[PDB]
A paper describes a structure:
To determine how this complex might inhibit cNHEJ at telomeres, we used cryo-electron microscopy (cryo-EM) to examine the structure of TRF2, [name] and DNA-PK on telomeric DNA. Consecutive rounds of classification and focused refinement yielded an overall structure at 3.58 Å resolution. Three additional regions of density were observed beyond the core DNA-PK complex: the first sits on the DNA as it enters KU and was modelled as the [name] SAP domain. The second region engages the neighbouring 10 bp that are protected by [name] in our footprinting assays and was modelled as the [name] Myb domain. Our structure suggests that DNA-PK complements this deficit by anchoring the Myb domain close to DNA through a neighbouring loop bound to the side of [name]. The third region sits on the [name] vWA domain and was modelled as the BRCT domain of [name], positioning a conserved basic patch on [name] next to an acidic patch on KU. A single point mutation in the N-terminal arm (R133E) blocked the footprint next to DNA-PK, consistent with the Myb–DNA interaction protecting this region. Biochemical experiments and cryo-electron microscopy reveal that when bound to TRF2, [name] establishes a network of interactions with KU and DNA that prevents DNA-PK from recruiting LIG4.
DNA-PK can also bind telomeres and regulate their resection, but does not initiate cNHEJ at this position. Here we show that the shelterin components TRF2 and [name] form a complex with DNA-PK that directly represses its end-joining function at telomeres. Our results reveal that it is the defining component of an inhibitory pathway, coordinated by TRF2, in which [name] directly and specifically supresses the end-joining function of DNA-PK by preventing the recruitment of LIG4.
Numbering used by the authors:
A (entry chain F): 6 to 558
B (entry chain E): 31 to 537, 557 to 609
C (entry chain D): 11 to 103, 132 to 196
D (entry chain A): 149 to 295
Write the structure that this text describes.
Amino acid sequence: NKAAVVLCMDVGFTMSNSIPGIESPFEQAKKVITMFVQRQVFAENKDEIALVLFGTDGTDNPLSGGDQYQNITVHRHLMLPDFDLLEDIESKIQPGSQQADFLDALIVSMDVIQHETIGKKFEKRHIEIFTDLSSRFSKSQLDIIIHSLKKCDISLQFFLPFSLGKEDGSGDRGDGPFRLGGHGPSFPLKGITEQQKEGLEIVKMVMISLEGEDGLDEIYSFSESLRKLCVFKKIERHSIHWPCRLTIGSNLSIRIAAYKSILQERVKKTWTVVDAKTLKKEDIQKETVYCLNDDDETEVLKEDIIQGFRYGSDIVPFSKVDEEQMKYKSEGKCFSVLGFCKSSQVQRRFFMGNQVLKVFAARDDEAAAVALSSLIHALDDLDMVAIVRYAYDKRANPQVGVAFPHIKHNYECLVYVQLPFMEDLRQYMFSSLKNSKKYAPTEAQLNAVDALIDSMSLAKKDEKTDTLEDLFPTTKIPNPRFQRLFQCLLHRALHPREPLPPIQQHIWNMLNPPAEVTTKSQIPLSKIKTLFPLIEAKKKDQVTAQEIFQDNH
Amino acid sequence: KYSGRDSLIFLVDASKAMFESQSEDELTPFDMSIQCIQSVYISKIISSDRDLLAVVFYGTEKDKNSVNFKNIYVLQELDNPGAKRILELDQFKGQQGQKRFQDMMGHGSDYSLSEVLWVCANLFSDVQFKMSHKRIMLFTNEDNPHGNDSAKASRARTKAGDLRDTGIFLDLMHLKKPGGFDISLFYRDIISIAEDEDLRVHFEESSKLEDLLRKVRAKETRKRALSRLKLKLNKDIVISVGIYNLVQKALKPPPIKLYRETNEPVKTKTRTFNTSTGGLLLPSDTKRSQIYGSRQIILEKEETEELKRFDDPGLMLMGFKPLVLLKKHHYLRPSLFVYPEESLVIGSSTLFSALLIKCLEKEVAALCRYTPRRNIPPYFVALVPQEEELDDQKIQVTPPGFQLVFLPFADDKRKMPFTEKIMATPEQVGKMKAIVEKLRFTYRSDSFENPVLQQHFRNLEALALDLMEPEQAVDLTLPKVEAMNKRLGSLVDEFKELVYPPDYNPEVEYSEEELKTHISKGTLGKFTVPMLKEACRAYGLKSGLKKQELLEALTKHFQD
Amino acid sequence: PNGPTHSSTLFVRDDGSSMSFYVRPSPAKRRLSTLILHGGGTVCRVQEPGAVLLAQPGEALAEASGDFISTQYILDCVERNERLELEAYRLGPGRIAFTDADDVAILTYVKENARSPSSVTGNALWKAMEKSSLTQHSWQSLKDRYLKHLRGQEHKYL
Amino acid sequence: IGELFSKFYGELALKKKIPDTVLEKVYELLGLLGEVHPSEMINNAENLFRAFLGELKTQMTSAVREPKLPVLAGCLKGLSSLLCNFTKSMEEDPQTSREIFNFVLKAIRPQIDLKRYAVPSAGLRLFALHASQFSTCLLDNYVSLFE
DNA sequence: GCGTGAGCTAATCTATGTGAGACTGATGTTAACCCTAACCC
DNA sequence: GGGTTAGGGTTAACATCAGTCTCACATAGATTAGCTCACGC
């Protein structure tokens, strides 16, 4: 449970060669590396990162052969990431004024992995390269790189300054289309030098010969990785095993393993109160002090306190021991099936819980897997869905839920989501929005809003192949809160004087719809504004925090 | 509306035939009525402990009311239900309870049926709060109280009509007794709910009293906005909507600390005490902090809330997505509800209705950036247009509006391990289909109750009325294993033979010298974490939880 | 037609004050209430400052608290029909060495100096280890994770 | 003696939100207690100065929270009616006088019209009561102040 | 220059509910260490 | 007379995570100081 990812940073004159209106590829790589390293530092994940450079004037190659291998400097070896790491990637001021072989960087990273991870346990090693593909090549390698067919858990992941989405994505527009962290529009495809073409070709051939056809989708653009969790792909640890047994009746039991799935995730670290005199937590001290009601008291001790539960207008004195004695007692973890109901009496609105489960199968023994697959296929080809009584442990409360069939071209399993209890449900009374006469919208308003929603559609039926090709999707953007917090913490740790930096531009471009949607909606938005009589500055408060008592100069 | 509290007044008969009944195991109707009132009290104190309940026996020999009237007794006045109020009522249960009532209240003493209704209106009119609803149940085992005197019947009808005009809806829960008569009679023009019924003359069973579903001991009724946000279609055109929640997790009320000697609540006082030098500290000399390895990051209190602010509170629309792109697997939080409100912006309802109509016409869902409070990071939301659905009884079950659906970020999606695809075959998928069809189920939302909450509430009831043993809740979420096994039949064994292989079962002591010798011995082996912890604690060294912490600290300090 | 066959003045104290006992509702309390009522004492509906905190024997939480009187006190006080001392029945009284270094120290000197296939999946041939070849832990765990470590060089080959 | 504590009893400590109006008059009481026989008050602490500050520059320099007017509108008549004793000035300690003057200048400068003229009135009252303590910072930006 | 009374809208202000951050402890899972059907030299 | 080949039976280490606690913020009636203006000085 410890990865070893090596970042193969590129520094070169062509790397810094840029055009107005577009960030330098070196700066884009710096942004991506800063994001990745700061996430893996401020989350305190236990894995070793190696940073190697290629293309700088100096050559500090640990092996370096007997000659050649020039202009590839190994900045740091396999170590736990430190603050100095991202400090000096922000202090790696000068891109090298030279050019080095691209494949030489790959073999340098490979030999670093081999010579630093000989006997240490590493769950999966990794090599990530952020290159330009604009340098002279060497057609003598790939006879040992490919021959090393991953007789180890090292893998490849190439990041290029291109717009690596390799389908019908012509674009080539001139509305300032490129934005770091932008979405949909990207770098103008094609218009590619007579070296980057063969560079991409041999990169594609390497990936095909390494992972297969599925490896084509494993190469990303610099702006793409700022809005995707693709750098940490093949480093993330799987959800932990949860064994149980799905039972129907009394004698029908199938060994099962429910792996965790989509669940809200928070920040692991915590803010500790510290006195502002010596920066020590030990000086601070807090404690609850229970005090009586009449004319205060000296103290009321812990041992003289008992529980109490409100019941009506008075209080009935319960106790901790009585709660433990007389309360609901289940029979440990259980995944019993109450029955089967049509997959139309449960609706997405009547869901609960902060998590979703994917009850996969038993373990590798393919005995219960056949039975579970038969059950899910019988649920899927037919209709109706299985209700389940699920309990985590003896202490955890038992909960009901639904287990929809979920069949994919790669795996087959059910999915669990909690249902509401009787007291858990709330019914409200709302006025009908269709029978009303005051708010019935006229035909002109209907047509205007129809044109509006047709203009701001976030999905194109491209190629007419009955495929709803998706525009900006929100289920792949990483939570911006964590990246913003990491940037703020890093700046405070490096510049303890400056105030909080403003939000990065690429984070803003990450969370905003593609420019085409915004542009195509201007006229419909104007028509809606001039047509709907929705104009009210009804005097109701205003957001003021600091610009009410401050000065000017 | 919001601050109004429902109110209830019972009206228990105490006639001679009301007490005497058939001589069998069936409960006397008086005991049935008292048990039902006790059940209503128990249900209404755990759920919505703010309504007013009062019980007014009529037909008694005694009399207690604001205006002196014969044969009417107000056992309790309008107030919140309480444990003492329940205990004041259970003494009338049983034959001994019947005798206690007879010696304490009496029976017979022919009444008027009008002054009782006047008295009920008196307590209804004596409340200094709002009156959301006013109801009067009339537990009676007779259907024709009068008939020998038409004047009393006319006066009762007039008073009932006056009560209905005032806004008082009475509904009698008729009690059945031996004989053949509980006919629809001089009570039909009195029931101000006027519930729809076949009105069959020859009823031969207890009336709508089992309809109570006695002791539905879990509920917390409330309706509130929970937010009032602005939906920005663009930078300049904004509409105002409210964000209600339709389904929300139910939790038992928090416990209260008590002083053992006096059994009175003790107020708590949390305050950061001195730095071992005396005094108290400011919110201005205690900055927040975090530590990563050897690097300490020191950050002020307000700057901590400053780094998690992105947008002003509101829903920033960002486009429309087809409904077929909202996968069922993705789910984080319970789905919220949006309704157009016209307090901050006038004209929001019309634009909202047009948007809803043309958004569910094209089967698309609005996509927005959601920020509920001042300093919360943005969270994308797909507003699914929920069309109003209504029953034949003109009852709304899915009110119209927009429903939030929290789309998870990529951070909130976990990755599964690789598994091998193994598919079934015919001739056992058919068997599974037969089993499933043999286990039909019409799932409903009002099906199950939280067993933990039910047990806790029953325990509280037992501890507040000394029931001498807690009521054992029938765990509704427990599978009926024997019944479903008998219903299934032998085809389960046909399944088991079909796929499962025949061999597949499916199921202190330490001191200076020993540690000085052991550090050179270098094991610190069978030495358990519980005893390393006690050694480091009783000796006074810094201690943690992981073994390596102690194994390093004790080794480095004890010798060096 | 019997059972309350003890003195009607037992649990009442010598000053005429009835002893107060608190028992949580339970099948035991069903009989204990009648037993105390016939004994002249009183049973508290809820916990009270002046009560006696009864507890059935065997309850871990009550015994750990050490502020409870066994319910057997009541039962043996009925048969004896004589009060007695309360405090007579008062409740209240490393497999570690598998670091990373030995994980490679295993394969070294065995992947070369091992010619008997019976060495694996079978005992012995750790006689060379742990006395001549030190591993500084127990000797029957190399043959428990060579099972977990029947693998290639650190993390595998494929 | 008995009021120095039992009102410092967590008006600066404690985590439970003290109600809005009980963050102005309590500080007013604490400040105005200092003009009654400063003989014993001379050895209490400097904690009152930090308490009157701290929340100032938090009630005044908060970029996340809406300022609460009836907190500093009442904390001002702290430092004012407390400066009547201990004779703080610029010659003997040119450290706290600068921030005191800056804060009162901010208080008397609203930068936006508003109802409930509470803080500015207290600002001018404090400035009028004793401006001699601001010996050298009263004549550096006299034009704007006079305006 | 200045008092003094009326109406109003801004400002609370507590009760109740909901969620985010910190925390704590029972629990079950993986794993170190050794023993055991059975044979067979 | 020692072992071999599997299947596994104790308990220690410890990582998880549901459950509980505290503090901040929302809405909804309920209630009043300030903030003006019309008069008298």
